[PDB]
Write an enzyme that holds these catalytic residues in place. Structure first.
Site, short mmCIF file in Angstrom:
data_model
loop_
_atom_site.label_atom_id
_atom_site.label_comp_id
_atom_site.label_asym_id
_atom_site.label_seq_id
_atom_site.Cartn_x
_atom_site.Cartn_y
_atom_site.Cartn_z
N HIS A 66 0.85 -1.21 0.02
CA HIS A 66 0.14 -0.10 -0.15
C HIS A 66 0.71 1.12 -0.19
O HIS A 66 0.48 2.35 0.75
CB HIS A 66 -0.94 -0.01 1.25
N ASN A 139 -10.17 -3.00 3.04
CA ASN A 139 -10.09 -2.63 1.76
C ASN A 139 -11.14 -2.27 0.89
O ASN A 139 -12.23 -2.03 1.82
CB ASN A 139 -9.38 -3.78 0.95
N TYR A 353 1.61 -5.31 11.70
CA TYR A 353 1.45 -3.70 11.68
C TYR A 353 2.20 -3.05 12.77
O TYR A 353 3.05 -1.98 12.34
CB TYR A 353 0.02 -3.48 11.76
#
Ligand code: HEM
Ligand code: HEM
Lengths: 680, 370, 680
Positions: A66, A139, A353
């Site tokens: 991304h 998404n 993350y």
């Protein structure tokens, strides 16, 4: 109300000021310090080194996925007091407002790739609540490629460029990706969504959003419901066509990010409604699949969406790097009233993350950055760290202690409004490195998706697969795709195999079915508004065309549209030149009156633009499904390329007739009659 | 300058601070000192290592009070948001700001106008730099005889640890070029032989201010006195009274005993002479210097006796109060001596406070030749 | 001889092997470790975290400039013993071979940007000599934007995207860039080179290369000459047209990097000749400019090029990241026989390149990386550092020592073949933060550059400026551009100002002149070879066209060409589909016989490709100046779009006649008659 109110403390205005070093003191930085006239530069030039050093270190690592994206600030307003389903503060009262930031992205390209590449798109929202930051990182497609997070490197490595030459950029049209899709059949569902309109949205503002995973909502008493997060666009779902997208990738790589910027800057802030599906815990495996499966979605016939609020993006960043680039979303940014589920994909994300921020930000103190700071306040025993911006008064940084007097204190379910895991949750069985047998149905839901699309949209998906699988240089991999495609549909395997020059294997009726669901289609519905959509008015500097065009523009703008008046050069009313123009930048094309002159004869050959430019804009726009128009004598332009006014999406006549026709057509947005479907 | 504030967090303030010689302002400038020139590069570069980023002057302890305006953007851990989107100069679009400052406009920094560069480009050093022995002699000549012994005795200790015999010979060659006496005196400890004299750089010149001990301290405030006492008898109350008196002159006094009684600041186990500027035994505390008293489970054997021994042998003022003299004579220290004080409490204090001005008594160290 | 011979020791083969952790031991990494079947993932799953951690930290910062690029290994062979001019080992003997690595790049785009964006291009070569690594870090353009390095951030900040929105990507077509060009008139010369063909090369193998700066060559006795480095392409200079490049940026972002890959892989290694200009030290200010000015180039009439050798790139990388991405060039990578000059731009670069590596590589030990390692050996007192790969035997890591016995030893001009600054060099004057007045002529040489271009090439530069300056939204900046353009040429200012809708300023003849120089033009010469060039043969699966098309291909390939046979689908002879094909990928288009069926009627409307696809490829290909062809009856295709075989660059007839015609056209490469020139 200014969603960026907290960020004011760190805004720096250099207006009316003298140049300074990073440590203060006034300077001039345009000449180096030399020994003699034409001399060497001196090492004692502190002004030079300090200036260049900051420039030399300007770059930080891009996101591992991304990487290419854009973002904006906004406000989220709740529609009610939702304590009946969740203990979350930001959904705890009607009319309660929370500042948000949203970042939209594409998954496989680097920082410089095109917005209009075919890819899955990201839709990551942060809620700056007064009970801490809560992130829905999701998404524009409700399903994912893999069922276990430990397979994320394998998936990403395949879709990203080949490690030998780094080709191709931001594309799945190579052997490695389709090798993976075939070898890991779990990817087939998302693959289909990628090949649909979702893979090429018109804008960030024209895509829905999904949390994808099943989560949990918890009340203060500890009662839980399974939940799915949705974002439904108040501007409608729209997509481009692949032949259009490719050309757009060159003429404007920044197409999506510019459109979002322009919309917000022009007072037309985009907005989304936040909706959910609520499922009873015993009904987790009720609906034909495991709800801890992220490769599956729950049809709205089984569970209708209930909207809890609406979010509007009304502010743009002041600095892209400080705000958009540096922001760090995590699914582990969770608050009281929400909890995770045993989704094998989600569980891994929670580690990834947080860990990946150490790479991008080079430190553990990345939530001290202004765009990462919560509005709720931070108190703990975390000390030191690289680039620590705070000074801590408490010198007793451990718990339990007598000397800090019990502070900072421990909060939980009963005291301090603290986070708590759902009490009903259990763990039962052996420790295993396996996946449940409820997860092995890879063909049933892609069929359900294909079946629920309009006949033209289905062709797009097939047309996408034909294009992509054509680039695979290994025949056996292409055979493997047909094998996997056949298990979904014999029609698809047959239709695709034509392009590959192969034959579709004999049908497999094992997973075949004719079920249908709503909300998975883009084109079958019309847009709620035509606001912000762009019309390019082709005109000319010769005659009275320009004055006529000016009148056309103001009329269109009043209705909410953004109009660009194109001509040979930048005259009085001319927004853009023919050289700088292309069909991809506009939702509709309309030729002004007297502009026929540039579609034929000497007019189409000027040094002021490449040959056939005005003719191409009309040709491209028509062939790409856009509403096309001509005003009065301008009809010659339409027959110059072979387009009859009788057709659908084509409008010819007086200005009042033409304006109305175009605006009506923009609601349709794309005219699917102009595309050939297999067989016929 | 007076230092009146302590850090709140050591790491945020003390550890993270980044000094540079290149942190210079208007009215100051560098010189062609080859040592200084390199520092200017080094200090700025090394911050990239410690702070992992180019934005280390954005850290609170590194931030100026004067304000920062320029076209520097991005960077790792950027704490600011910049309003000006025209981050280049010269521009029409920023309307001339941030502006360029110099000698005449904006009070900007400027290199000295009289400065010049003349000659060939060279990787050499000036021949004016080749006298390495004259100033060390100048320094040695300007030291008190005991201080001179310290320097030589220090070299004796240090050079003794060198395991290569030839290197020690090499040291003697360089030491000899400065002073033969130093070379002679050092060579004794190393068990080597002093080379023949070199009169080339020898001299007897002298300058002031290079010595530490030969002058007396402006103030004895904050300096620490350790009162060796005991928990039984009348030592403690006398010691407590001694404490309050001493603090008034600016001192900080620690009352030492077998254990933490009412007036006891520190224990004998946790105490050592190094923590104090002066040691004074309170009256009746003699009980712990000999017999069963010197051997208690509450502290290592001989502890009070060591502290007094340590304090005296290290040049510190030593003291006994009244009958406490037996303690000083336990180790062979007579009250007649310099830096040693015995008598009434007021007599001792006055002696000690005077002694603190002397600070160190150099009579207690042996000098070469004797 | 395989330049990557040194790199063999660090190559890892995972073939025939079991999966392992990074610390060894055999594993399975496709399932997470869960608590109870459909349980949560366990923190004690070391296999998961170790795999994901490496994935999360895969990213390193992209280069601050020249981020987008590609590279290859090669060998440099000397043509002679050049000790008469330089003491350099790699130029010290005839037929002497040195391994090289070269990386070509664009200056303004990020890692994902398009290869075919208008930009200055990089041409950076490393020489792995036996006296240490020596780098010629240069562009494809002999001049630079600025005359002082301290102004480098100002230039780069302006050309790169706007800090508010990060728009636009890889383009100078915005207000900030042209604000800089006008406000800093020093940038005008390179600006013209950027707007010429140099801004859009056909390939990496089709551009010359320049050191730009004046350097020094030194002999063992210490005698010096000022030098300029040149790389002259043995494949010829070729460029695209802007309208082509834009479409190409979308259809293939990887155009340049793929082309270099394919050429080497197909045995057609590209080669350059290394040439120099030698100028006496006393002749520094002789030729109408200061030779320490990088905004100037030295005409070959004043000093012709003398070639010293040839370098050929015959090896491709095995891993892009390890080799191409991680490589670190510096102008400060210099050896004995070379020295710097008092070029204020070059002086600053020396600091910058070394300093910026600390950012990208996160350590001071980046020359321990295999692609940065020299072949000559490294011995010094450098110790410790982050990621230290070596163990040092010498425990006496200081240089004035008895114990190491003087080693490592100190080397200089006389002993140890050590580096030395030129002995004749001096410093005279005040210490100054100013630039010499010899640097103040910013307009004469761009005029000289413009004058030395073919009339169409002149139009291209103007057509580029019209396009670019059209995107500036501030009218005053455009006025400022016209003022600077006017100082160079009134005609250029006149011609550009038309598009901007502004008025041409009154002439200023101060810098006007009619002088001309050679070698700065691209189109006026024909390509030495057509090898590697690509022809797309448009055919169809219907009839006998395919066999007919196949026979054409076999004929073409012997001459060195690369042929792609296009059809509706992947039949026996079909390389590519119409869906996957575009004119940008080909140097020439030729319609096979019987392929006329798809250029009109039902054939042009198939579900297998977007409508009008074959017709566009011919239309685009013709309009872009490429050789176009039809075979026999295929003439039907050419007259469908209005192209007569009578024209120049168009060939129709028998196959044998067509083949000879296309191959002839490819030497011309681009047909400039098809572009309109101002006034007409
Ligand atoms: C349904 C599945 C997934 C969704 C919806 C998703 C969504 C996203 C989004 C929107 C971003 C961009 C964040 C931003 O814009 O700053 C992102 C980045 C990222 N994702 Fe995923 N992703 C998924 C799967 C995974 C998995 C399975 C993993 C790891 C096991 C993963 C690891 C990461 C990492 C490490 C980043 C970089 C974040 C940063 O650098 O700030 N993702 N993902
Ligand atoms: C004639 C002037 C210049 C030329 C020919 C030039 C050329 C190049 C080239 C070809 C690269 C690509 C490196 C690669 O391919 O790996 C590069 C990178 C770079 N250049 Fe320049 N440039 C010039 C001006 C400057 C100046 C004036 C500065 C600084 C004051 C500078 C600083 C840099 C930096 C920091 C990089 C990044 C390299 C890395 O990150 O490894 N350049 N330059």
């Amino acid at each position: 109300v200014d969603a960026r109110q907290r960020l004011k403390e760190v805004e720096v205005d250099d207006n009316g000021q003298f140049m300074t070093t990073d440590f203060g003191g006034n300077i001039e930085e345009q000449f180096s310090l030399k020994a003699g006239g034409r001399g060497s530069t001196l090492l004692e030039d502190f002004i030079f080194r300090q200036k260049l050093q900051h420039f030399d270190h300007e770059r930080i690592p891009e996101r591992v996925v991304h990487a290419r994206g854009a973002g904006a600030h906004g406000i989220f307003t709740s529609y009610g007091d939702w304590s009946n389903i969740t203990a979350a503060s930001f959904l705890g009262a009607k009319d309660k407002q929370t500042p948000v930031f949203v970042r939209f992205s594409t998954v496989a390209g680097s920082r410089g790739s095109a917005d209009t590449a075919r890819d899955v798109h990201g839709f990551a929202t942060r809620f700056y609540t007064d009970e801490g930051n809560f992130d829905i990182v999701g998404n524009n497609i409700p399903v994912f490629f893999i069922q276990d997070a430990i397979r994320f490197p394998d998936l990403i490595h395949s879709v990203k460029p080949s490690p030998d030459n780094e080709v191709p950029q931001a594309a799945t049209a190579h052997d490695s990706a389709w090798d993976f899709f075939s070898s890991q059949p779990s990817a087939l569902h998302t693959l289909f969504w990628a090949m649909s309109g979702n893979g090429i949205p018109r804008s960030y503002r024209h895509m829905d959003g999904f949390g994808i995973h099943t989560f949990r909502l918890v009340t203060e008493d500890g009662k839980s419901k399974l939940v799915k997060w949705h974002w439904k666009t108040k501007q409608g779902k729209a997509a481009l066509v692949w032949e259009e997208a490719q050309v757009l990738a060159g003429k404007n790589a920044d197409f999506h990010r510019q459109d979002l910027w322009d919309a917000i800057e022009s007072g037309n802030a985009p907005s989304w409604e936040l909706a959910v599906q609520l499922i009873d815990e015993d009904k987790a495996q009720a609906y034909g699949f495991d709800l801890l499966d992220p490769t599956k979605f729950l049809p709205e016939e089984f569970a209708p969406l209930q909207v809890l609020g609406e979010m509007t993006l009304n502010r743009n960043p002041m600095n892209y790097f400080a705000e958009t680039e540096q922001i760090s979303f995590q699914p582990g940014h969770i608050v009281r009233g929400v909890d995770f589920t045993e989704d094998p994909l989600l569980q891994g994300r929670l580690y990834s993350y947080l860990d990946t921020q150490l790479n991008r930000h080079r430190g553990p103190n990345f939530e001290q950055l202004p765009i990462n700071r919560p509005v709720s306040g931070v108190h703990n025993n975390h000390r030191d760290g690289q680039g620590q911006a705070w000074i801590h008064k408490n010198i007793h940084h451990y718990s339990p202690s007598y000397l800090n007097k019990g502070y900072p204190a421990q909060a939980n379910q009963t005291v301090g409004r603290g986070f708590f895991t759902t009490p009903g949750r259990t763990a039962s069985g052996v420790l295993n490195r396996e996946l449940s047998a409820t997860f092995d149905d890879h063909y049933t839901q892609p069929r359900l998706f294909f079946n629920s699309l309009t006949p033209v949209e289905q062709q797009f998906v097939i047309n996408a697969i034909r294009f992509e699988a054509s680039h695979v240089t290994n025949e056996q991999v292409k055979k493997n795709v047909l094998e996997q495609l056949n298990k979904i549909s014999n029609d698809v395997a047959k239709r695709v195999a034509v392009a590959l020059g192969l034959e579709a294997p004999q049908p497999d009726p094992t997973y075949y079915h004719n079920n249908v669901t709503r909300g998975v289609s883009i084109f079958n519905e019309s847009l709620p508004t035509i606001a912000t959509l762009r019309v390019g008015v082709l005109s000319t500097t010769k005659g009275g065309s320009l004055d006529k065009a000016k009148a056309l523009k103001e009329q269109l703008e009043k209705d909410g549209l953004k109009v660009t008046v194109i001509a040979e050069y930048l005259a009085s009313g001319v927004d853009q030149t023919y050289s700088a123009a292309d069909a991809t930048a506009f939702d509709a094309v309309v030729v002004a009156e007297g502009a026929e002159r540039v579609f034929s004869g000497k007019g189409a050959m000027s040094p002021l633009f490449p040959a056939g430019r005005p003719s191409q804009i009309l040709t491209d726009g028509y062939r790409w499904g856009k509403p096309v128009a001509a005003v009065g004598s301008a009809k010659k332009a339409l027959q110059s390329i072979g387009v009859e006014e009788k057709e659908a999406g084509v409008y010819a006549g007086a200005q009042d007739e033409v304006i109305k026709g175009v605006e009506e057509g923009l609601k349709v947005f794309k005219f699917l009659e102009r595309f050939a479907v297999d067989g016929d």
